[PDB]
Amino acid sequence: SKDIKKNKNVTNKLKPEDITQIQPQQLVLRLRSGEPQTFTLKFKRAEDYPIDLYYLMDLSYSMKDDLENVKSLGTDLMNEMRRITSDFRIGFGSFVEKTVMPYISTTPAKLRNPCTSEQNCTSPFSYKNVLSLTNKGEVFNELVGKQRISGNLDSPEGGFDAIMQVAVCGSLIGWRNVTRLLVFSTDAGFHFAGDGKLGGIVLPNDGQCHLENNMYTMSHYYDYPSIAHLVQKLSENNIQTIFAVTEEFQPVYKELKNLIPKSAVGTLSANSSNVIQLIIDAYNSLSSEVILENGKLSEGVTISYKSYCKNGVNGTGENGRKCSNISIGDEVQFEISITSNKCPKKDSDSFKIRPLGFTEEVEVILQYIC
Amino acid sequence: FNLDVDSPAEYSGPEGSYFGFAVDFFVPSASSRMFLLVGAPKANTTQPGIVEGGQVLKCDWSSTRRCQPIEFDATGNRDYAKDDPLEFKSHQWFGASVRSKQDKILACAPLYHWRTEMKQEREPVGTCFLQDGTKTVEYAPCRSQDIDADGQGFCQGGFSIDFTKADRVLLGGPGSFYWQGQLISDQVAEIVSKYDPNVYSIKYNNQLATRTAQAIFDDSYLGYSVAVGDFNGDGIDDFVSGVPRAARTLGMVYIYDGKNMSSLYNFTGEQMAAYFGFSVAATDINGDDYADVFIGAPLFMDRGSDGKLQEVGQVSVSLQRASGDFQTTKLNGFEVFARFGSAIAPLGDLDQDGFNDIAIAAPYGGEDKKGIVYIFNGRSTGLNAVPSQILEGQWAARSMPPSFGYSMKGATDIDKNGYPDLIVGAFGVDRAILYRARPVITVNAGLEVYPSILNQDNKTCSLPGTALKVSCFNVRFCLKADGVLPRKLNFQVELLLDKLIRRALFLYSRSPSHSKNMTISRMQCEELIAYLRDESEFRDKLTPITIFMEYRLDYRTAADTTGLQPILNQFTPANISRQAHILL
Numbered sequence: 001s002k003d004i005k006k007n008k009n010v011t012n013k014l015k016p017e018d019i020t021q022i023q024p025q026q027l028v029l030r031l032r033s034g035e036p037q038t039f040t041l042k043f044k045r046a047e048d049y050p051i052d053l054y055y056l057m058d059l060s061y062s063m064k065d066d067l068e069n070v071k072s073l074g075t076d077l078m079n080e081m082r083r084i085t086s087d088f089r090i091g092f093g094s095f096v097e098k099t100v101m102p103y104i105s106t107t108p109a110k111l112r113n114p115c116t117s118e119q120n121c122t123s124p125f126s127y128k129n130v131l132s133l134t135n136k137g138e139v140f141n142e143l144v145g146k147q148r149i150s151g152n153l154d155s156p157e158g159g160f161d162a163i164m165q166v167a168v169c170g171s172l173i174g175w176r177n178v179t180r181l182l183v184f185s186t187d188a189g190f191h192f193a194g195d196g197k198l199g200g201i202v203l204p205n206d207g208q209c210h211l212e213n214n215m216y217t218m219s220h221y222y223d224y225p226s227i228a229h230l231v232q233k234l235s236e237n238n239i240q241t242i243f244a245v246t247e248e249f250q251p252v253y254k255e256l257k258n259l260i261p262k263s264a265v266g267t268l269s270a271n272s273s274n275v276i277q278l279i280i281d282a283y284n285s286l287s288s289e290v291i292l293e294n295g296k297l298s299e300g301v302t303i304s305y306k307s308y309c310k311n312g313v314n315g316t317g318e319n320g321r322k323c324s325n326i327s328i329g330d331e332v333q334f335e336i337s338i339t340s341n342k343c344p345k346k347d348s349d350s351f352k353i354r355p356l357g358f359t360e361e362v363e364v365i366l367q368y369i370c
Numbered sequence: 371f372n373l374d375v376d377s378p379a380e381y382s383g384p385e386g387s388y389f390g391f392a393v394d395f396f397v398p399s400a401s402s403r404m405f406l407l408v409g410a411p412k413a414n415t416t417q418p419g420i421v422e423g424g425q426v427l428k429c430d431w432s433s434t435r436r437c438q439p440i441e442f443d444a445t446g447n448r449d450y451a452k453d454d455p456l457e458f459k460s461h462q463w464f465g466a467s468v469r470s471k472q473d474k475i476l477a478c479a480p481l482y483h484w485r486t487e488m489k490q491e492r493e494p495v496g497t498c499f500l501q502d503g504t505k506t507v508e509y510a511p512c513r514s515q516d517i518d519a520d521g522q523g524f525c526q527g528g529f530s531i532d533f534t535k536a537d538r539v540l541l542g543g544p545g546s547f548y549w550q551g552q553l554i555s556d557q558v559a560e561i562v563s564k565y566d567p568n569v570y571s572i573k574y575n576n577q578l579a580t581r582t583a584q585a586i587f588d589d590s591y592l593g594y595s596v597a598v599g600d601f602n603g604d605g606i607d608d609f610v611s612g613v614p615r616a617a618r619t620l621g622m623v624y625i626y627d628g629k630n631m632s633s634l635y636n637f638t639g640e641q642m643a644a645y646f647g648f649s650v651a652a653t654d655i656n657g658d659d660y661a662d663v664f665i666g667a668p669l670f671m672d673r674g675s676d677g678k679l680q681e682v683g684q685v686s687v688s689l690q691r692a693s694g695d696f697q698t699t700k701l702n703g704f705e706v707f708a709r710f711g712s713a714i715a716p717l718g719d720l721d722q723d724g725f726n727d728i729a730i731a732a733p734y735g736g737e738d739k740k741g742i743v744y745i746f747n748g749r750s751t752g753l754n755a756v757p758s759q760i761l762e763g764q765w766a767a768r769s770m771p772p773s774f775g776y777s778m779k780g781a782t783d784i785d786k787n788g789y790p791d792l793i794v795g796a797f798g799v800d801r802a803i804l805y806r807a808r809p810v811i812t813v814n815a816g817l818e819v820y821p822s823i824l825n826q827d828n829k830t831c832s833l834p835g836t837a838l839k840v841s842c843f844n845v846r847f848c849l850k851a852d853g854v855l856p857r858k859l860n861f862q863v864e865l866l867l868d869k870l871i872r873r874a875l876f877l878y879s880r881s882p883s884h885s886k887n888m889t890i891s892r893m894q895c896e897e898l899i900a901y902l903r904d905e906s907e908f909r910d911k912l913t914p915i916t917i918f919m920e921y922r923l924d925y926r927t928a929a930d931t932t933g934l935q936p937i938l939n940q941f942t943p944a945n946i947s948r949q950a951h952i953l954l
C-alpha cells in the first residue's frame with residue numbers, strides 16, 4: 001500500500017524561510033514482491049527567496065586589472081540583485097596558490113614581492129576570507145578596495161583549496177539556510193589532487209575548515225581537493241557554483257561544470273566588466289532547472305522518475321528527474337515509482353528525496369511485504 | 371592468494387620521517403644477503419646545517435629486522451662564493467624515489483634546489499645519487515645552463531626513476547619547460563665515468579632527452595611516473611611515462627623509443643582531472659612476451675549504487691598486440707576516495723602458474739582508511755579482474771592516514787623459496803612490510819565406488835568379526851600432489867558413507883568413516899571394502915548412498931625452515947562424492 005503521512009501545501013508582506021516548495025514531505029510505501037508503487041511530488045518555485053553570494057576571486061598577477069574593476073561590485077551587485085530578491089547578502093574571498101616550492105618562488109626577495117620588483121604586489125597566499133557575508137555592500141566596496149594583487153610561478157592556480165574552505169567553513173563565511181551562490185573568478189586553469197606531490201604534499205585534502213584570521217593555514221600540508229571531493233562538500237553544504245572564467249578557458253571550465261552538480265559557466269570579460277550580467281544569467285540558468293536526488297537506496301529495490309514539465313513535455317529515463325525553463329512561481333510535477341524484490345532487515349528503510357540546491361526534502365519510508 | 375599475511379616482517383623508521391614512501395629490493399651481485407631499500411624522505415640526517423635532508427635505509431631481512439641508513443652524502447651545502455650558497459638541501463626529499471638493480475642503487479631528491487651560476491636563485495632542478503659498487507656519484511641532468519622555468523629550472527629531475535635492462539637510467543622531470551615535463555636517459559657507465567665533483571653541469575655523450583615544445587604543451591607534468599618495457603619489438607626497453615595534466619587534465623601517457631627518444635604511442639584519459647598517469651607499470655600479463663601497459667587514474671569517478679558520481683579510481687589494462695595496437699579494458703576501484711590505482715607493482719608470477727601477476731593499491735581504502743592492496747593474477751586472456759587476495763593495512767591513523775600501499779615493490783624472491791615476494795610501504799606511520807609468498811600445492815583427488823549397484827543377496831566377503839558373509843563393495847580413493855617443496859606431503863583424508871542411520875559401513879571397522887594419514891611425493895591410491903547392513907536392520911532402500919571423501923591441508927609438518935606453510939591452489943575442490951545404489 002501507499003499512505004502519505006505529511007503534506008503541507010506549497011506556499012503562495014513578510015515571509016521568513018519556512019516556505020514550502022516541495023509536497024508531500026513524508027510518506028510510507030508498503031512494497032509487495034516486485035509491485036511498483038507510484039507517488040507524485042509537486043514543486044513550486046518560491047516567488048521571493050533570499051540569496052547568499054560569496055565572491056571568490058583569483059588575485060594572481062594576471063588578475064590585476066580585474067581587481068580594480070571590483071572595488072564597487074558589492075553595491076553594484078546589491079542594487080542589481082534587488083530586482084530579484086528582498087534579502088541579499090554579499091561576501092568576498094581571494095586566492096592565489098599553495099605557498100610552497102615549486103608553485104611559488106622561495107627567494108627572500110620574491111617571497112616578499114613575487115612580481116617583477118616594479119609592481120606593488122603583496123605576498124602569495126592560499127586563501128583569504130576578506131569579508132564574510134553581509135548585507136552592507138558599503139563594507140564590501142571598502143574592503144575589496146584595500147586588497148592588493150599578488151602573483152606566483154606556474155599558470156594554473158590554487159582555487160580548489162579555497163573552494164573547499166568556503167563550502168565547509170559554514171558560519172565563518174556566514175552562510176544562511178538559503179540559496180547559496182559561490183562565484184569562482186579566474187583567468188587560468190586549476191590545480192587538483194595529485195598536483196601537491198611536486199611540493200611534497202602527499203596527504204589528501206581532509207575537507208575540514210582550517211581558517212585562522214580568515215587565512216587558510218594548511219595548504220602546505222593538505223593536497224588540493226579532487227573534483228569528486230569538491231562535489232561531495234559542495235553538495236553536502238548546498239552551494240551552487242558559478243564559474244566566471246575568461247574566454248580561453250571556457251572549454252576547461254565548461255567540462256568542469258558538467259561534473260559539478262548545480263554549477264554554471266559564464267564568460268568573463270577582460271577587466272571583469274560583465275560580472276554582474278554574468279551572475280544574473282547564471283542565477284536564471286540555475287533557478288530555471290530543478291534536479292532531484294535521492295539518498296542511498298537499498299539493494300534489490302529500484303526507483304524510476306517521470307517528469308511532467310512546462311508545455312506538457314514529458315521526460316523519461318534520467319530526463320525524468322529534472323525540469324527546465326521553470327519561471328518564478330511555476331509549478332511542476334514528478335511521479336516516482338518504487339519496485340521491490342527481496343526484503344532486507346528491520347523493514348524500516350528511510351531515504352530522502354531532495355532538490356539539488358535546497359534544504360527541503362521528502363522522507364520516503366519503505367515497508368517490505370515478506 | 372598465496373601471500374603470507376600471518377608472519378610478515380614489519381619494519382619501522384624514525385617517527386615522522388615518512389619511512390616507507392618508496393620501496394625496492396637490494397640484490398647485490400656479490401649475491402650474499404638481500405635487503406629492503408626504503409625511503410624516508412623527511413628523515414633528519416647528520417649533515418651539517420641540513421634539516422630533513424632525508425635518507426634511504428637498508429633493512430636486514432636476515433633475522434634482526436633493524437634498518438641501517440645508507441650514507442649517500444654526509445656533507446652540507448656547497449658555497450658558490452663567500453656567504454653565497456650554491457645549493458640548498460633542507461627538505462630536499464632525498465629518498466622520495468628509490469630504485470635498485472643488482473649493486474646499483476639510485477635514489478633522488480626531487481625538491482633539491484640550487485642557486486644557478488648567473489643569479490642568486492632557488493630553483494628545484496632535483497638531484498640523484500648513484501651508488502654503484504664502490505664509487506658513489508651525483509646525477510643531476512637537470513642542473514644545467516638552461517635555467518629558470520623557461521628551461522630546466524623547476525624540472526625536479528628524479529621525481530620518478532627506473533632502470534632499463536641495458537644499464538640506462540630513465541629519469542622523469544615533471545617541471546622542465548614550464549612544467550611541460552621531460553624524460554632523460556643516460557647510460558649508467560657514463561654517469562659514473564664522467565662524474566666530476568667540481569663540475570656542476572656534467573655533459574653526457576650518450577644522453578637521451580625530450581626537447582622543448584610549443585606553449586600549448588605547457589602544464590603536462592611529463593615524467594610524473596615512469597616505467598620500462600619493449601613496445602616496438604627490438605629487445606631494447608622503451609620509455610613509458612604518465613603525463614597526467616595533458617589534454618586539459620584528461621591526462622595522457624607517452625611511450626618513447628629507447629634508442630632515439632622518439633614517440634611511439636600515446637594513451638589519453640577519458641575523464642577530466644582523474645590524474646590519468648599518476649602511476650604506470652609495464653609487464654607482460656598474458657604470457658605472450660609482449661609487455662602490457664597499466665595506467666592508474668586514482669581520481670576517476672564512476673556511477674555508484676545510486677545515480678551520484680563517486681571517486682573510486684580506475685586502472686586501464688592495455689594488452690600489446692603484435693600488430694602494434696593495444697587491446698584495452700578498464701578496472702575500477704571498490705571503495706569511495708580509496709585512490710585505487712595510486713601505485714601499481716608488477717609482482718612477477720606470485721603463484722607461478724606461468725602468467726605474471728600485479729598488485730594495485732588503494733592507499734586510503736579499508737576500515738578506518740588504513741590502506742588496502744589488491745592482488746590480480748594473469749592468464750592467457752589477460753588480467754583476471756577479480757582480485758585473488760586483499761592485503762589490509764594493520765596500523766591505525768596516528769597523526770595522518772597510514773597510506774598503506776602508497777608505494778610497493780615486487781618481482782624479487784628474497785627468501786629463495788622459488789616465489790617472488792612483495793614490499794608494501796606505509797609512510798604515514800613510518801612502516802614497511804615484507805609479505806612472504808607461500809608455495810602453491812596442486813592436489814588431484816580420485817574416488818571410485820565399484821560395483822555401484824549393490825545386490826543384497828550377493829554376499830561375497832566375510833565380515834572379519836563374525837562368520838556371517840556380507841554384501842560388499844570397493845571404495846578406492848587416489849591422491850596426487852606436486853616450487854621448492856617437501857618431498858613427503860602429509861595428507862589427512864576422511865571418508866563418510868551414506869548421505870544421512872548410516873546404512874553402509876566399512877568391513878574392518880563397522881563404522882561409516884575411515885580417516886588415513888597418507889603421504890604423497892611431488893600417483894597414490896588406496897583400496898577399501900565396505901558392506902551393506904542386513905535388510906532387516908533398516909527400511910528405506912530408496913535413498914541413494916553417497917560416498918563423501920574430504921582431503922585436508924598438510925597442517926604443521928608442511929612448513930618451511932622459516933615456518934612458511936604452503937597453500938593448496940585456489941582452484942582446489944574441498945571434497946569429492948560418489949554414489950552406490952541398492953536393487954529391488
Ligand SMILES: *[C@@H]1O[C@H](CO)[C@@H](O[C@@H]2O[C@H](CO)[C@@H](O[C@@H]3O[C@H](CO[C@H]4O[C@H](CO)[C@@H](O)[C@H](O[C@H]5O[C@H](CO)[C@@H](O)[C@H](O)[C@@H]5O)[C@@H]4O)[C@@H](O)[C@H](O[C@H]4O[C@H](CO)[C@@H](O)[C@H](O)[C@@H]4O)[C@@H]3O)[C@H](O)[C@H]2NC(C)=O)[C@H](O)[C@H]1NC(C)=O
Binds near residue numbers: 587635
Ligand atoms: C603523442 O602526443 C605528443 C604530444 O601531443 C605528440 O608530440 C607532438 O608532436 C607534434 C607533431 O609531431 C610536435 O610538433 C612538432 O614540433 C617540431 C619541433 O618544433 C620546435 O622546434 C623547432 C626547431 O627548433 C622550432 O622551429 C619550433 O618553433 C616553430 O613552430 C612554432 C609552432 O609550431 C612556431 O610558433 C615558431 O614560430 C616556429 O615556426 C618548435 O619550437 C616541429 O619541427 C614540427 O613541425 C613539423 O611538422 C609540422 C606539422 O606536424 C609542419 O607544419 C612543419 O613544417 C614541420 O614539418 C611539429 O610542429 C610537438 O612538439 C610534439 N609535442 C610533444 C610534447 O612531444 C606525439 O606526436 C604523439 N604521439 C603519437 C604516436 O601520435
Ligand SMILES: *[C@@H]1O[C@H](CO)[C@@H](O[C@@H]2O[C@H](CO)[C@@H](O[C@@H]3O[C@H](CO)[C@@H](O)[C@H](O)[C@@H]3O)[C@H](O)[C@H]2NC(C)=O)[C@H](O)[C@H]1NC(C)=O
Binds near residue numbers: 385
Ligand atoms: C628534524 O629536525 C627538525 C629540527 O632539526 C625538526 O623541526 C622542528 O619540528 C618542531 C615540531 O614540529 C617545530 O616546532 C614548531 O614550531 C612552530 C613555530 O615555528 C610552532 O608553532 C609549533 O607549535 C611547533 O612548536 C620546529 O619549528 C621545527 N624546526 C625546524 C623545522 O627547523 C623536525 O621535526 C625533525 N623531524 C623529524 C622527523 O624528526
Ligand SMILES: O=C(N[C@@H](Cc1ccccc1)C(=O)O)c1ccc(Cl)cc1Cl
Binds near residue numbers: 114115151152154155
Ligand atoms: O606572471 C607571473 N605569474 C602568473 C602565473 C603565470 C606564470 C606563467 C605563465 C602564465 C601565468 C600569475 O601570477 O598569474 C609571474 C611569473 C614569474 C615571476 Cl618571477 C613572477 C610572476 Cl608574477
Ligand SMILES: *[C@@H]1O[C@H](CO)[C@@H](O)[C@H](O)[C@H]1NC(C)=O
Binds near residue numbers: 176177359
Ligand atoms: C540549517 O538547517 C539544518 C537542518 O535543516 C540545521 O541543522 C542547521 O542548524 C541550519 N543552519 C542554519 C545556518 O540555518
Ligand SMILES: *[C@@H]1O[C@H](CO)[C@@H](O)[C@H](O)[C@H]1NC(C)=O
Binds near residue numbers: 308
Ligand atoms: C504528458 O502527459 C500528460 C498526462 O499527464 C498529457 O496530458 C500530455 O499530453 C503529455 N505530453 C506529451 C508531450 O506526451
Ligand SMILES: *[C@@H]1O[C@H](CO)[C@@H](O)[C@H](O)[C@H]1NC(C)=O
Binds near residue numbers: 627629
Ligand atoms: C629512430 O630510430 C628508428 C630506427 O631506425 C628510425 O626508424 C626512426 O626514424 C628514428 N626516429 C628519429 C626521430 O630519429
Ligand SMILES: *[C@@H]1O[C@H](CO)[C@@H](O)[C@H](O)[C@H]1NC(C)=O
Binds near residue numbers: 820
Ligand atoms: C558380487 O560382489 C563382488 C564384490 O566385488 C563383485 O566382484 C561381483 O562381481 C558381484 N557379483 C555380481 C555383480 O554379479
Ligand SMILES: *[C@@H]1O[C@H](CO)[C@@H](O)[C@H](O)[C@H]1NC(C)=O
Binds near residue numbers: 860862887927
Ligand atoms: C601423520 O604422520 C606424520 C609422520 O608420518 C606425523 O608427524 C603426524 O603427526 C601424523 N598425523 C596424524 C593425524 O596422524
Ligand SMILES: [Ca+2]
Binds near residue numbers: 061063155
Ligand atoms: Ca593567474
Ligand SMILES: [Ca+2]
Binds near residue numbers: 103
Ligand atoms: Ca599557479
Ligand SMILES: [Ca+2]
Binds near residue numbers: 603608628
Ligand atoms: Ca624498443
Ligand SMILES: [Ca+2]
Binds near residue numbers: 654661
Ligand atoms: Ca602481453
Ligand SMILES: [Ca+2]
Binds near residue numbers: 718724726
Ligand atoms: Ca600468476
Ligand SMILES: [Ca+2]
Binds near residue numbers: 785790791806807
Ligand atoms: Ca619468496
